[PDB]
Design a protein around this ligand. Structure first.
Ligand SMILES: CCCCCCCC/C=C\CCCCCCCC(=O)OC[C@H](COP(=O)(O)OCCN)OC(=O)CCCCCCC/C=C\CCCCCCCC
Ligand code: HEM
Ligand code: HEM
Lengths: 49, 421, 101, 44, 55, 443, 220, 41, 54
């Protein structure tokens, strides 16, 4: 059946702040997205130059 | 404060206005009409089906656009429920926007235009609406049952036959509404509304011809045997004889016999102890199944019997066993307590069915349509338990005696024919 | 007025689509409204419109016209699509107004 | 305003194999047929 | 019709079906990069060439 | 008489608490019939690795007889009074209730109190429900909507308790013992975490009296009083794609993390969800439906059905949508759906929410049509809000919702958030999480 | 057949011998023409009553022998023609299987005139059972039948089939002179007897068309 | 090697004599051929 | 796809533009100047190239 199906453990690939399963993933959302978008925004600046 | 009673007015038209204020924050107005496929002939089959799908189409006072947009603008809803010989046009909304939604309701039922291109575009929805309703195997045999039980009127299918999809003319819709949607065949039934308003509306707007219009050829009985072989692992089967009609004194006796034999489990995932039918079959077969008592009451006729959902090879065991339970019930096998226990189960079922807004409006409008009155719930409780134990065994006698008609669809490799019971 | 009404009859002849055996509504440019109104046309009127157009097309590639006898008279011109087109526009204007609410 | 929707494939048409999760359905009345402006079509 | 104007627009369509929604194998390597390199290199040579040709 | 007055003139819901912590609530009307049952704060979230689906296994054995009266007697007694016994179990809420005449109310409460406490759990009976549940699993496995929503939880709350199905594993159902079942009942079915709700022609005082009699002795320790604080569940921007091209139509569910029962934003999210609404090919309104997504779904034949949901839990939730579509209409459907999500955060007009509020008003009122749906609301309102929220109060919260607020709340929970994606069936046209993820920003 | 053809010998899977029902299947499809068949159990292949039914078939009449021609010999075609106004077709239906058979009439008629044709076609078998069979009618039918048989075996298809049909069942071929003996050795009483079996036996009817005026089986 | 074909799909003769010769002389044969149109009687 | 005129992705827009392309039956000589401009462009480019080489 489908009840016998679960999601594998991704702790090997997860970031630091979403590693704990009993911790809210949202409190560190802006922190995680803010970094990757900073990398992008910088690459845009370097390109613009 | 307080809760004041229900009012009924019979207009000069012959139109019935059954209102009731319950001070519920939600109003629910309906238009009960004596229409349906019962009044179809071989020339206009399916025109009753297409008719209820034609509710959102343009009217003489509201566009197909404004009908849907105007009703949704106030959280309201519009729906059309209909059986083989009844048609109800319902609207639900907040107490405030009654008059708003009341317009579109009145426009749909009393002034459709049935524009040829809108009708044509609507035709293929018959294929869709039928296909999703026919997903439940019961509607399959239930339509085949009426076809095998009668010769006309009630023999006509509730859903439009395939060969007439897209072949229903815009005129046939016009003629059907003109011939059946007449004042002495309708009833403006409301809930959460003052009677003086519902009466004012019915007078200030209902104009379609008086009288009775087209009548129906009374249901001739047949007694046929329709069988569908479709290889489904589960076999549905229904066996009925001519039951009883609405209003008949014989009707209450069948409803009690229904609960004596048993009609659908009252406990979730539970076996049925009171049900002599469920239990009697359980002794005969091994595997999971379902076997209930089947009872319909129409205006001029009715059907009564049993419906068995069983496994393929065990269909024979279940059907024969279910048959014996009505034989043994007719041979006297009915305790005086069984009656009182069934008369109790029945008085219960009735009462909690009228809890809902749907159940209340329907129960009021059903009677107000036929016998322009509303019976006090205490007297309907009198009329039911005033049924003897003999009346029940008599109803069982009529089944074993009368000519049977059977409808069964499934892998009928082990499903018995009607001359084998 | 009857003065503007006579001007009508002059323009109808000066236009000269009647020489092709075309109705006034045959020469209508098919925008979104006309397209919709056309789909509402009865089978007979639609199949007739189709022939008149195909005939005008065939005439146009021949650089010929119909004999004077077969020219559509001004008073005999059927506005067969105009009632349909008016409702199509009326319906649309309603939606456009109802959507700005 | 309420009621669950559905949909099947046509041309050929498009949860009933237990004793209990198939039960509750065995025709008590006859066959009602509903259709709505904004609510899923129903059947009894 | 078609919902968006990315699948519709006959100009934006082959822009879409070549550089946006175009199905590609999930595992092609860096050896598949030199296709788009040649493309850009061609547009680069043409531009630098035009600027040189004007003198 | 109008709407604004018929909301205040609704008989208030009475609440009283026993010694053991059990709450009793009632909505008294003049109904000859009534619905009365117990709503327990127990589900599959309270379960774990080894007792998963035990509460569901329990639900099967609730009606199968008690200590005082075995299966034969219990079923015969309940049927004879024309009473209907029903119940369910969710991820966070279990309930057992009875529909009967208003006169049988005290006997009913006794019947209820007997099941939750003195359940039989016959060793022979358990072995039968082994195959019964195992069949209900095979049955529910063909419900594509069911499989999808289970998969949604399995990946949205992956690695937590909320990721588990209510019914449990096959192995668990196979090997669950009478000890395991009895343990669940004793551990979870406790007075302070239970609510005895009733609705109909029932005197509240008579109710708490019969309740005081059959709902029993006081807990001794402090441990048995305290209500457990469940460990938090972690949301994961993720996807699960179960592909089967032989499957006729595909199912897709997409959701972001919700606020939880307590949050007042849950009202606005319901107003927003009302804007987009729902559809299936039997909606007679057709191309003229007010819902933009529904109109586009009709105009372009995007799907067989689509629905929006705001499933709330204790500390979290699932705001999203689900649709059923043909293999080649998925991408366009998902496209338009995500577009209307952005339209919520960006373009929502006052005209839109003026309709949505009217729909939500009519919805919550329709929610209370009967004794059972009132009892369900009451049994849940106490269990989640700690109190009853009258329709009068709901209206006040809803009527304060405007377009500027819907934009803000949606921008807070939807915009540029990593959503959870469950896709089942022939699902080629819908592909790449990154594309779906990019559909979360800029309308 | 021997130095090439073999595989599984014996008699293999057998068939559950045909149980009779007597049902009424009706198809409503709005076609302006209504087809209808009414039969009872006939005679099996190689039966005693086998030849008697075939003669009764030609007595009632089975398909015109003249292009665009009315059927005079056919008491069925003629008997119905007196009852209805419009074009139609009404022939005698007879099948002979291994363990059973069917016999009756098949009427292709107009929609509203289906009732007239079917009832009339029924009366012709009633009147045929009540004695209405001339000794000449038999000899005239026995002649039409001996003819039909003979020219059917002209073709390569007809000859190979007729030979192989008998060689399969009763591993012989009967001389055409003896099959001519077995047929006209049928009495006039044998024919009226076969008609008696129809009016007596339980009928089964199949009809597809616009059955708005097509009678049910309990109306004959 | 002989016989006429036909064509239809899924998913008149209204005069007494031009639709005559049909009422089942026998009953119903079913023929299909490697290279000849599917027979029916 | 039977022939290789409707198949060949090169010959197929050659086909759907200059061979099987549906055109109105009654367009006049005023519709000729499209193809004239096309040929004139290819003519100017060729004569221009020959001039540019000197
Ligand atoms: C000089 C600075 C150049 C910066 C260019 C950035 C850029 O081109 O990005 C464009 C665009 C991003 O669009 P989406 O986020 O997918 O759109 C979502 C729907 N609106 O696509 C690209 O990134 C192209 C560059 C690779
Ligand atoms: C694939 C495209 C091209 C290639 C491979 C190419 C290659 C070359 C090479 C190898 C040289 C020799 C320069 C040197 O070694 O000193 C050159 C010179 C030159 N090319 Fe191109 N070229 C390309 C496109 C163009 C275009 C499109 C133009 C003009 C429109 C152009 C104009 C010139 C000019 C003016 C020079 C002389 C400048 C110089 O010698 O450095 N080129 N090109
Ligand atoms: C649409 C395409 C073209 C147009 C309209 C055009 C037009 C002209 C015109 C008006 C002149 C002026 C000549 C005169 O009046 O004396 C000219 C000259 C010239 N063009 Fe073009 N031309 C085109 C294409 C080309 C191309 C493609 C090339 C080279 C690749 C080219 C190369 C030249 C040269 C070398 C001259 C100088 C010769 C002269 O002056 O007669 N031309 N062109």
């Amino acid at each position: 059946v489908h009840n016998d199906v679960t999601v594998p453990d991704f702790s090997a690939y997860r970031r630091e702040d979403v590693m704990d399963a009993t911790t809210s993933s949202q409190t560190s959302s802006e922190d995680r997205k803010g970094f990757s978008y900073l990398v992008t925004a910088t690459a845009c600046v370097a390109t613009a130059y | 404060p307080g809760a004041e009673d229900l009012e009924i007015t019979k207009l000069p038209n012959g139109l019935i206005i059954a209102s009731l204020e319950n001070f519920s924050p939600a109003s629910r107005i309906g238009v009960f009409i004596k229409a349906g496929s019962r009044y179809e002939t071989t020339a206009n089959l399916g025109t009753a089906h297409l008719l209820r799908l034609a509710s959102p189409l343009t009217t003489k006072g509201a566009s197909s656009f404004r009908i849907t947009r105007g009703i949704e603008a106030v959280g309201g809803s519009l729906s059309v429920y209909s059986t083989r010989e009844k048609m109800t046009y319902c609207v639900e909304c907040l107490r405030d926007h009654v008059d708003t939604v009341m317009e579109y309701l009145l426009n749909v039922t009393t002034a459709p235009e049935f524009r040829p291109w809108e009708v044509t575009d609507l035709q293929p929805q018959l294929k869709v609406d039928k296909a999703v309703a026919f997903q439940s195997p019961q509607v399959g045999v239930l339509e085949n049952l009426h076809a095998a039980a009668y010769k006309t009127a009630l023999a006509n299918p509730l859903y439009c036959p395939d060969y007439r999809i897209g072949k229903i003319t815009s005129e046939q819709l016009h003629h059907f509404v003109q011939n059946n949607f007449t004042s002495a065949r309708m009833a403006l039934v409301g809930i959460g509304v003052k009677h003086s308003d519902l009466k004012q509306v019915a007078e200030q707007f209902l104009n379609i011809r008086s009288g009775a219009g087209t009548s129906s050829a009374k249901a001739t009985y047949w007694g046929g045997e329709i069988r569908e072989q479709n290889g489904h692992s589960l076999v549905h089967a229904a066996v009925v004889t001519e039951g009883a009609a609405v209003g008949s004194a014989e009707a209450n006796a069948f409803s009690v016999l229904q609960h004596v034999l048993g009609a659908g489990p009252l406990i979730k995932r539970g076996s049925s102890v009171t049900s002599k039918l469920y239990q009697g079959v359980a002794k005969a077969t091994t595997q999971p199944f379902d076997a209930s008592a089947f009872n319909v009451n129409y205006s001029d006729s009715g059907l009564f019997g049993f419906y068995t959902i069983s496994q393929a090879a065990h269909a024979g065991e279940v059907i024969r066993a279910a048959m014996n339970q009505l034989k043994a019930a007719a041979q006297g096998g009915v305790t005086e307590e069984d009656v009182t226990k069934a008369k109790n189960q029945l008085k219960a079922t009735y009462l909690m069915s009228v809890e809902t807004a749907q159940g209340l409006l329907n129960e009021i409008g059903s009677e107000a349509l036929l016998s322009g009155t509303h019976t006090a719930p205490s007297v309907v409780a009198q009329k039911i338990d005033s049924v003897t134990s003999a009346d029940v065994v008599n109803a069982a006698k009529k089944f074993v005696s009368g000519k049977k008609s059977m409808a069964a669809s499934g892998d009928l490799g082990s499903t018995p024919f009607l001359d084998e019971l | 007025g009857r003065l503007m009404d006579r001007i009508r009859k002059w323009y109808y002849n000066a236009a000269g689509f009647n020489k092709y055996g075309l109705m006034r509504d045959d020469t209508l440019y098919e925008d979104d409204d006309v397209k919709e109104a056309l789909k509402r046309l009865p089978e007979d009127l639609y199949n007739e419109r189709m022939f008149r157009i195909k005939r005008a097309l065939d005439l146009s590639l021949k650089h010929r016209i119909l004999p004077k006898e077969q020219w559509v008279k001004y008073e005999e011109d059927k506005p067969y699509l105009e009632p349909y087109l008016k409702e199509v526009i009326r319906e649309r204007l309603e939606r456009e107004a109802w959507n700005k609410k | 305003x309420x009621x669950x929707x559905x949909x099947x494939x046509x041309x050929x048409x498009x949860p009933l194999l237990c004793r209990e999760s198939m039960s509750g359905r065995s025709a008590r009345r006859d066959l009602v047929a509903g259709i709505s402006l904004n609510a899923p079509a129903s059947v009894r | 019709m078609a919902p968006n104007i990315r699948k519709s627009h006959p100009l934006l369509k082959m822009i879409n079906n070549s550089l946006i929604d175009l199905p590609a194998p999930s595992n092609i390597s860096a050896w598949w990069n030199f296709g788009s390199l040649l493309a850009v290199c061609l547009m680069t040579q043409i531009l630098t060439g035009l600027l040189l040709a004007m003198h | 008489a109008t709407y604004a007055q018929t909301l205040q003139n609704i008989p208030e819901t009475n609440v009283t608490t026993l010694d053991n912590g059990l709450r009793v609530a009632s909505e008294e009307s003049s109904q000859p019939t009534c619905t009365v049952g117990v709503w327990i704060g127990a589900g599959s979230r309270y379960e774990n690795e080894k007792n998963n689906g035990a509460g569901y296994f329990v639900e099967h054995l609730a009606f199968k007889g008690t200590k005082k009266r075995p299966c034969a007697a219990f079923e015969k007694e309940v049927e004879s009074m024309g009473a209907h016994f029903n119940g369910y179990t969710s991820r966070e809420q279990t309930a057992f209730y009875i529909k009967a005449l208003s006169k049988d109310m005290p006997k009913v409460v006794e019947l209820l109190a007997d099941v939750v406490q003195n359940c039989a759990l016959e060793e022979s009976q358990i072995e039968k429900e082994r195959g019964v549940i195992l069949q209900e699993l095979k049955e529910m496995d063909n419900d594509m909507t069911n499989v999808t929503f289970d998969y949604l939880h399995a990946t949205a709350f992956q690695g937590t308790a909320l990721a588990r199905t209510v019914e449990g594993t096959t192995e668990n159902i196979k090997h669950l013992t009478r000890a395991d079942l009895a343990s669940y009942i004793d551990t979870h079915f406790k007075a302070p975490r239970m609510v005895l709700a009733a609705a109909g022609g029932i005197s509240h005082k008579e109710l708490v009296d019969a309740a005081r009699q059959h709902f029993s002795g006081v807990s001794f320790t402090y441990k048995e009083d305290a209500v457990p604080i469940l460990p938090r569940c972690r949301f994961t921007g993720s996807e699960i794609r179960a592909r089967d091209d032989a499957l006729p139509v595909a199912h897709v569910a997409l959701a972001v993390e919700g606020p939880g029962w307590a949050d007042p934003d849950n009202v606005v999210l319901h107003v927003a969800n009302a804007i987009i609404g729902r559809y299936d090919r039997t909606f007679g309104g057709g191309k003229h439906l007010s819902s933009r997504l529904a109109a586009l779904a009709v105009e372009h034949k995007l799907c067989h059905s689509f629905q929006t949901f705001n499933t709330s839990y204790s500390d979290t939730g699932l705001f999203g949508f689900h649709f059923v579509a043909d293999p080649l209409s998925i991408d366009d459907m998902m496209f338009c759906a995500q577009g209307e999500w952005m339209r919520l955060c960006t373009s929502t007009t006052e005209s839109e929410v003026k309709r949505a509020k009217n729909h939500l008003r009519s919805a919550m009122v329709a929610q209370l049509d009967g004794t059972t749906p009132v009892c369900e609301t009451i049994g849940s309102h106490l269990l989640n809000y700690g109190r009853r929220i009258s329709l009068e109060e709901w209206d006040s919260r809803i009527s304060a919702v405007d377009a500027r607020m819907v934009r803000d709340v949606c921008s807070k929970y939807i915009y540029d958030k990593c959503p959870a994606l469950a896709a089942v069936g022939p699902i080629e046209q819908l592909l790449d999480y990154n594309r779906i993820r990019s559909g979360m920003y800029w309308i």
